[PDB]
Symmetry: D2
Subunit: 56 residues, 4 copies
């Protein structure tokens, strides 16, 4: 499932004077899943069941 709002990612990239390839947002979606999986490991390592912003 896509967790990313493609239009908002493309908008931010455009605001900096860059373009986005057709498959760029797919790559970022993969990185986002990795960031979350890493955060869950940190949450568990601190004996918590609630993910906090500082866990990412």
């Amino acid at each position: 499932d896509t967790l990313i709002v493609a239009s908002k990612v493309k908008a931010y990239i455009k605001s900096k004077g860059f373009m986005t390839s057709g498959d760029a947002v797919d790559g970022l979606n993969e990185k986002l899943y990795a960031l979350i999986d890493d955060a869950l490991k940190r949450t568990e390592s601190n004996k918590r069941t609630t993910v906090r912003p500082t866990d990412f």
Copy 2:
């Protein structure tokens, strides 16, 4: 601006047995902006203005 679908991020975290704090999605959003800023630097370093999935 939010780059993610909060409901889908919270759902994925719940599917792994975890809850999400009120500001956890905001933390992930901040990390995503940092990942994009890093990617723009990599795009420019390869004499491109089109961001590719491999730049993230």
Copy 3:
């Protein structure tokens, strides 16, 4: 100060069939300082004074 063992980073890169530019290890040193600074924020966020491997 350099926190990286340049010879061991270059060795690992060589083992994968790649070469290392003259200024590559400097870039990785900068990323390492960022990783540590992020980890210290996570340590403090969990009311600890001792950095753990899971904080990185």
Copy 4:
């Protein structure tokens, strides 16, 4: 193999007011190998075999 100077990493962490767990440097080493593996993928994606600082 360790890619970092443990004494200098522990010193930097101490300078910021923190202690380092016995296996904390091992955790950072693991993250560094991941950063290099990601960089090799970026190098190859730009039709290069020489890793640049901007690939990390």
